[PDB]
Amino acid sequence: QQVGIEALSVYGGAAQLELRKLAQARQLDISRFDNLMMKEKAVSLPYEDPVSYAVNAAKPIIDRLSDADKQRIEMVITCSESGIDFGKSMSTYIQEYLGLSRNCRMFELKQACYSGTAGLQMAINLILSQTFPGAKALVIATDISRFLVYDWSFAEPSSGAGAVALLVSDTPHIFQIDVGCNGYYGYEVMDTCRPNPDSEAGDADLSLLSYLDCCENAYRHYQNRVEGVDYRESFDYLSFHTPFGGMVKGAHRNMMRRLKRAKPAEIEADFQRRVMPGLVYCQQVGNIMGATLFLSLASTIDNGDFSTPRRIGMFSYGSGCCSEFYSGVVTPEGAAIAAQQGISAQLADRYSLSMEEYEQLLYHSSAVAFGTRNVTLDYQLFPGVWKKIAGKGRLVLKAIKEFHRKYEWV
Amino acid sequence: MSKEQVLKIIKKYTREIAPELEDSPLEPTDSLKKLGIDSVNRAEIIMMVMEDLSLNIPRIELAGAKNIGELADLFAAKL
Numbered sequence: 001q002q003v004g005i006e007a008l009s010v011y012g013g014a015a016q017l018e019l020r021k022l023a024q025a026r027q028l029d030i031s032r033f034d035n036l037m038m039k040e041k042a043v044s045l046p047y048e049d050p051v052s053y054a055v056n057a058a059k060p061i062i063d064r065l066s067d068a069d070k071q072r073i074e075m076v077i078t079c080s081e082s083g084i085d086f087g088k089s090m091s092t093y094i095q096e097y098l099g100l101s102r103n104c105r106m107f108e109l110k111q112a113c114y115s116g117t118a119g120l121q122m123a124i125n126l127i128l129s130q131t132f133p134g135a136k137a138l139v140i141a142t143d144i145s146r147f148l149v150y151d152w153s154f155a156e157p158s159s160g161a162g163a164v165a166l167l168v169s170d171t172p173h174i175f176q177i178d179v180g181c182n183g184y185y186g187y188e189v190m191d192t193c194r195p196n197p198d199s200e201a202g203d204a205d206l207s208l209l210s211y212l213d214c215c216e217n218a219y220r221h222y223q224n225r226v227e228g229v230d231y232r233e234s235f236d237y238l239s240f241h242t243p244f245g246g247m248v249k250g251a252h253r254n255m256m257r258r259l260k261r262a263k264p265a266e267i268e269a270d271f272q273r274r275v276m277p278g279l280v281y282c283q284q285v286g287n288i289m290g291a292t293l294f295l296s297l298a299s300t301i302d303n304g305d306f307s308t309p310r311r312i313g314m315f316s317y318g319s320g321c322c323s324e325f326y327s328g329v330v331t332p333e334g335a336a337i338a339a340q341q342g343i344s345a346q347l348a349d350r351y352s353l354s355m356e357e358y359e360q361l362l363y364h365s366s367a368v369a370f371g372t373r374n375v376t377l378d379y380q381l382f383p384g385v386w387k388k389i390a391g392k393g394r395l396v397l398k399a400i401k402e403f404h405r406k407y408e409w410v
Numbered sequence: 411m412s413k414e415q416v417l418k419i420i421k422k423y424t425r426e427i428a429p430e431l432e433d434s435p436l437e438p439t440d441s442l443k444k445l446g447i448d449s450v451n452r453a454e455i456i457m458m459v460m461e462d463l464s465l466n467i468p469r470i471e472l473a474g475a476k477n478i479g480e481l482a483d484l485f486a487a488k489l
């Protein structure tokens with residue numbers, strides 16, 4: 001049975017901060033963030049939230065569908081660690097604003113940055129079940145980092161905002177899944193967590209060690225299930241959950257040293273060939289939590305070579321923790337479709353924040369904290385940011401009125 | 411192997427990772443973070459020491475130390 005990603009679309013925010021500006025502002029040398037392969041992070045405005053990010057990521061997918069094909073979407077899974085209610089799924093708002101069928105299962109899925117992968121696997125299994133032949137699923141991984149002015153101070157440089165939408169079906173035009181080629185591994189660990197709203201706590205050192213343990217053990221489980229697979233030879237590219245690129249470089253090095261006994265120069269050449277293409281877009285948005293691996297996939301497709309079909313290995317990790325290694329294939333035709341989305345152009349067109357604007361943005365973010373009952377957003381907070389958004393057919397958060405979020409196309 | 415033998419091995423890979431500390435005295439109370447060793451390289455040092463000692467256990471079992479002396483203690487307790 002054929003299954004996988006029929007369409008993929010990204011929203012990398014309306015504004016970004018260049019991390020060199022953050023380094024300068026805190027008296028650090030530039031080399032610290034360049035060293036860690038970090039360039040820019042996306043930053044959500046007060047009039048954006050994970051719903052608006054999600055809708056903006058999915059809108060190009062839905063716009064292309066025939067009415068018949070839009071009506072075939074019968075499951076919407078929102079994957080997030082940035083939820084807005086203890087019970088109400090963001091999927092309900094997403095369905096409303098995309099105009100989807102009422103005959104649609106809707107829910108939200110949580111397991112830190114593993115959420116996206118978990119949603120994708122549930123969607124794959126809907127198609128494989130053949131319970132509703134022809135049904136499609138829409139999986140949207142969406143997350144923002146709404147720091148308020150800390151427990152979160154360790155994560156400021158790395159924590160971005162972004163969403164990636166996947167249409168999943170039996171005609172996988174973009175990414176053809178290797179069915180049943182999955183390894184997964186998890187255990188309870190306090191590496192990082194989000195025990196309060198609008199916040200994150202943890203020991204990033206423990207988290208890196210746990211990521212490395214899971215990278216090894218999830219892949220071993222896959223290897224046990226896929227006889228004769230080779231970590232170098234079977235995968236043309238590798239995409240990873242990417243908290244920052246430097247640690248993905250470290251993980252890949254650890255894997256190559258253990259599995260292939262590769263020498264340092266050989267490992268570095270392999271890194272540039274197979275792993276760097278996936279980092280390109282990640283470096284422009286920062287860690288976007290459950291969406292990051294999907295962004296890495298999109299980056300691999302756009303920035304790698306698909307003149308013949310290629311197999312991509314995928315590694316997902318979420319703190320707390322759970323992980324999965326899985327794989328699929330992209331054809332030249334699929335890569336050509338992906339290129340038409342113009343992700344690189346979208347990212348280049350975002351507003352570049354000054355450090356003054358960024359600090360103001362943080363200060364102004366308290367007005368839309370978790371649990372807000374009533375707020376009316378000022379779209380002219382930053383007139384220049386608005387000029388970049390207005391007229392593009394973007395969804396924004398207009399207001400919250402008695403906990404009901406109201407959105408507007410601008 | 412003992413706490414003091416392991417501390418020597420931690421000092422070796424620390425200097426190998428940060429060549430600028432080659433001719434610097436490192437004390438048990440020194441922390442890799444305060445020495446300027448970044449997040450990726452702090453993990454790398456742990457993994458190099460694990461491999462030197464043929465210690466094939468989960469990497470997270472070496473987490474939580476606040477200085478190199480405490481890291482030495484963690485390794486010593488595992489074998």
Ligand SMILES: *P(=O)(O)OCC(C)(C)[C@@H](O)C(=O)NCCC(=O)NCCS
Nearest residue numbers: 154155157158204207208211243448449
């Ligand atoms: P290190 O002291 O070089 O710090 C790394 C860094 C400044 C990116 C820092 O902001 C950080 O640790 N951020 C990442 C937190 C995180 O998501 N870690 C996950 C490891 S799996």
